[PDB]
Ligand binder design. Structure first.
Ligand code: NA
Ligand code: NA
Ligand code: NA
Length: 126
């Protein structure tokens, strides 16, 4: 299940405290961890971000009612920071992985893990 990816593969690392998997077109949430609610406006904006990544620097990244400073924005990867916390968003063929990381994990760790789950999903065809 997509929930199994959120629970086991992302949250189960101990380095990502909140996660979601959303359609790549930004029309729905396929799976999300408890209390991490991404509005239709937020996922549509993020999806639009992958189609015009330089624009994400001006707007920042708004997810679950919180704005993050845009640190990386490219075709498949959009990263944000909020002090020592942040989010990693990676587009696969069919989905977008969203990973929030807390104070105690390095951005590099969180990026590495969700980039990896992304390539895996691309390899499988999703
Ligand atoms: Na900003
Ligand atoms: Na990258
Ligand atoms: Na990396």
């Amino acid at each position: 299940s997509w929930q199994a990816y959120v629970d086991t593969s992302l949250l189960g690392t101990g380095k990502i405290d909140r996660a979601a998997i959303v359609s790549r077109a930004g029309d729905s949430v396929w799976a999300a961890s408890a209390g991490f609610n991404l509005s239709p406006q937020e996922i549509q904006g993020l999806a639009a971000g992958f189609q015009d990544p330089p624009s994400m620097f001006g707007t920042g990244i708004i997810l679950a009612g919180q704005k993050y400073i845009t640190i990386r924005a490219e075709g498949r990867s959009i990263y944000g920071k909020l002090q020592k916390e942040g989010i990693i968003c990676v587009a696969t063929k069919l989905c977008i992985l969203v990973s929030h990381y807390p104070e105690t994990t390095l951005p590099g760790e969180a990026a590495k893990i969700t980039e990896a789950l992304a390539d895996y999903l691309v390899g499988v065809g999703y």
